[PDB]
């Protein structure tokens, strides 16, 4: 028995994602709960609602099956006009709605799942200003704002700064943490542990992800990752499975069991 | 105690010179033995000799510190002329000397450490013919010939075949096994375990390598790899460390200790 979360993207084939393919998510929530997942990270926020439901109903539904309503992936990128002007004030109204909806749902974190590699350091800097501004507003609402990587953030901008490094270095720790996707970090030739040591404390959440089932490909050193979890600053871990050797239910269950069986995964990080 | 080998390349910096001795490997042999490595893979074959010594002297030296003289990296790429002619006859006499020297040293395996990505499938085919021919000669001297990868072998040739796949598919199992470098496979976006399942029995040795010390980076899933070792066909494992967080002795000892401590690493694979 360990505190292990689940990215609801993992079951998007059953409940949908990012505003589409919707089903009644409640039976799946129950199965995930019964498997022994203890928290959820959502993957379908839109216009004040979660999977089409009010924050109150979503919170109730998640609470009904005994899981923590922990985190949520959602975001709003800057238009080319906002990037060129450096003025992203119109975007902030969307965040007032988003932050109030997350607070009503009980959420502890909000994580932006994706930003494009910008063309220039100046653009990156504007993104940093935006991330700081979002994270500050989140912080005032009692929420921790984070960023989730794929592999593209390990590229360089203007052949100077690695994008993820720039973001980390040019955001305030209390405004932005990194929800590090260890699979995608490895895919971008990055050492998760080396990142942990370069930016201690900034990795408040991990996406525990692999090619398919967690711990099956040989491509991720979860032992080392979890051994350096204190340096990283890990508070919570979120299993993500996007591709499957089996039916989805079994893939996500085997994924949890790997962590439950792993001696290097502690019962709680919080 | 576990049967764990060491690639002598890993301590290339600790093999020095004084007086008439240009490759004084004996002190390092001792140290490696004392750390607890049980077998060596050589990285210095030329002109019938190992580290400038006769096969009998090298064999004596290795045996004197109680390690197995197991394997050896050496190679002879095809010239552009041999590639274009398809006729690699001239290279085969080099192999007669090489194989006889390995037999005199007691070697169980010979492994070629690098072949370039060829431009065409036709050239890849020629390489496979060459590998088959070498492996056949090795086999008749009671030696198993193998191929060691980096990352480049996961590229596609003519945007058709992945190079390593082509090699495996178009060589005889009895002529060629793969000494899979798990670190470099990951660096090529390859799952070691999926390779094991695609080509059962063909990975008779692993190069146990990481970014630096074995098991420290978070980039290699040793647990999964070792759990699939039987499928793979693993007979021996060889630690390789080329880059170091510490002084070389400490780095290669920490590397052994990770495997000695890992419950998923068995005492013997042979
Ligand atoms: O809550 C009060 C404080 O927080 C506000 O968001 C303002 O940024 C700051 O100027 C003010 O003093
Ligand atoms: O931390 C900045 C960059 O340099 C590091 O040495 C790593 O090689 C790379 O993975 C990382 O993106
Ligand atoms: O052959 C000994 C060593 O030398 C080569 O340069 C390879 O990079 C390495 O994979 C090998 O272990
Ligand atoms: O024999 C030639 C063919 O066999 C190889 O194993 C591959 O399947 C294919 O890509 C190649 O063209
Ligand atoms: O083995 C075949 C190739 O295709 C697979 O789908 C993998 O993505 C790749 O790592 C591998 O090289
Ligand atoms: Co993810
Ligand atoms: Co190697």
Ligand 5 contacts CB of residue B160 (under 6 A): no
> Cα separations (Å) of B70 from A82, A203, B3, B192?
63, 43, 11, 23
d(CA A108, ligand 1 centre) in Å:
21
Beta carbons of B260 and B215 less than 8 angstroms apart = no
Contact: B221, A224; criterion CB under 8 Å: no
Resolution at which this structure was determined, Å? 2.1
Question: At B73, phi and psi to the nearest 5?
Answer: -95, 120
Beta carbons of A236 and A70 less than 8 angstroms apart = yes
d(CA A270, ligand 7 centre) in Å:
39
Q: Collapse the DSSP code of B2 into the 3-class scheme (helix H, G, I; strand E, B; otherwise coil) and give the result.
A: coil
User: β-pairing, A161-162 with A109-112?
Assistant: unpaired
CA distance A23 to B95: 65
Residue A107 lies in a domain: yes
Residue B270 lies in a domain: no
Contact: A221, B211; criterion CB under 8 Å: no
Q: Collapse the DSSP code of B114 into the 3-class scheme (helix H, G, I; strand E, B; otherwise coil) and give the result.
A: coil
Residue A215 lies in a domain: yes
Cα A37 to the center of its chain, rounded Å: 16
Most B-contacting residue of A180, A218, A244 (CB-CB within 10 A), to test interface? A218
Q: What is the CATH number of the domain that holds A148?
A: 3.20.20.150
Ligand 5 contacts CB of residue B165 (under 6 A): yes
> Cα separations (Å) of B229 from A111, B72, B145, B149, B196?
38, 21, 19, 18, 8
DSSP state of B79: P
Chain B nearest CA to A223, separation (Å): 7
Radius of gyration of chain A (CA): 18
Give B181's contacts in chain A (Cβ within 8 Å): none
Residue A115 lies in a domain: yes
Question: At B12, phi and psi to the nearest 5?
Answer: -60, -35
Chain B residue with CA closest to A183: the answer is B219
CB pairs under 8 A between A and B: 76
CA distance A88 to B255: 50
DSSP calls for B226-260: HHTHHHHT--EEEEE--S-SS-HHHHHHHHHHHHH
CA atoms within a 13 Å half-sphere pointing along the CA-CB vector of B78 = 25
Ligand 5 atom 5: the closest Cα is on which residue? Answer: B190
Helix (H) or strand (E) holding B72: strand B68-72
CA distance B27 to B30: 5
Q: How many CB atoms lie within 10 A of CB A244?
A: 17
CA distance B36 to A4: 38
DSSP state of B155: S
Which structural domain, as residue segments, surrounds residue A61? 5-261
Q: What is the 3-state secondary structure (H, E, C) of chain A?
A: CCCCEEEHHHHHHHHCECCECCCCCHHHHHHHHHHCCCEEEECCEECCEECCECHHHHHHHHHHCCCEEEEEECCCCCCHHHHHHCCCCCHHHHHHHHHHHHHHHCCCEEEECCCCCCCCHHHHHHHHHHHHHHHHHHHHCCCEEEEECCCHHHCEECCCEEHHHHHHHCCCCCCCEEEEEHHHHHHCCCCHHHHHHHCCCCCCEEEEECCCCCCCCCCCCHHHHHHCHHHHCCCEEEEECCCCCCCHHHHHHHHHHHHHHCCCCCCCCC
CA distance A131 to B213: 36
DSSP state of B10: G
Contact: A218, B187; criterion CB under 8 Å: no
Ligand 4 atom 3: the closest Cα is on which residue? Answer: B166
Of B87, B45, B98, B42, the closest CA to residue B67 belongs to B42
CA distance A199 to A145: 17
Residue A266 lies in a domain: no
Contact: B217, A194; criterion CB under 8 Å: yes
Residue B210 lies in a domain: yes
Q: How many CB atoms lie within 10 A of CB A111?
A: 26
CA distance A157 to A116: 11
> Cα separations (Å) of B250 from A8, B38, B62, B214, B256?
44, 17, 21, 12, 10
Residue B10 lies in a domain: yes
Give B218's contacts in chain A (Cβ within 8 Å): 182, 185-186, 191-193, 220-222, 224-225, 228
CA distance B31 to B65: 9
Residue A201 lies in a domain: yes
Of B61, B47, B26, the closest CA to residue B11 belongs to B26
Beta carbons of A121 and A161 less than 8 angstroms apart = yes
CA distance A217 to B223: 10
Ramachandran category for residue A133: left, alpha or beta (phi over 0 → left; psi -120 to 50 → alpha): alpha
State the total domains in chain B: 1
């Amino acid at each position: 028995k360990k505190d292990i979360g689940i990215q609801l993207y993992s079951v998007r084939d059953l409940i949908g994602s990012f505003g589409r393919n919707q089903h009644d998510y409640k039976p799946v929530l129950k199965a995930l709960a019964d498997m022994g997942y203890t928290s959820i990270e959502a993957a379908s926020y839109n216009d004040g609602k979660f999977y089409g439901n009010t924050p109150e109903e979503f919170r109730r539904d998640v609470e009904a099956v005994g899981m923590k309503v922990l985190s949520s992936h959602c975001g709003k990128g800057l238009s080319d006009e906002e990037l060129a002007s450096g003025d992203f004030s119109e975007s902030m109204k969307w965040w007032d709605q988003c932050i109030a909806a997350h607070k009503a749902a009980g959420m502890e974190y909000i994580v932006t799942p994706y930003l494009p590699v910008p063309k220039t350091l100046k653009e990156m800097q504007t993104y940093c200003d935006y991330l700081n501004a979002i994270g500050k507003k989140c912080r005032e609402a009692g929420i921790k704002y984070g960023y989730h990587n794929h592999a593209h953030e390990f590229q360089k901008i203007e052949d100077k700064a690695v994008m993820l490094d720039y973001m980390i270095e040019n955001t305030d720790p209390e405004n932005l943490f990194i929800e590090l996707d260890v699979y995608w970090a490895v895919m971008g030739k990055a050492s998760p542990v080396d990142y942990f040591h370069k930016y201690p404390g900034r990795f408040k959440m991990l996406h525990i992800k692999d090619r398919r089932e967690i711990g099956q490909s040989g491509m991720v050193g979860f032992d080392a990752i979890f051994e350096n979890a204190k340096t990283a600053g890990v508070e919570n871990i979120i299993v993500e499975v996007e591709q499957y050797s089996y039916d989805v239910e079994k893939s996500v269950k085997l994924s949890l069991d790997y962590l439950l069986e792993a001696p290097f995964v502690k019962a709680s990080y919080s």
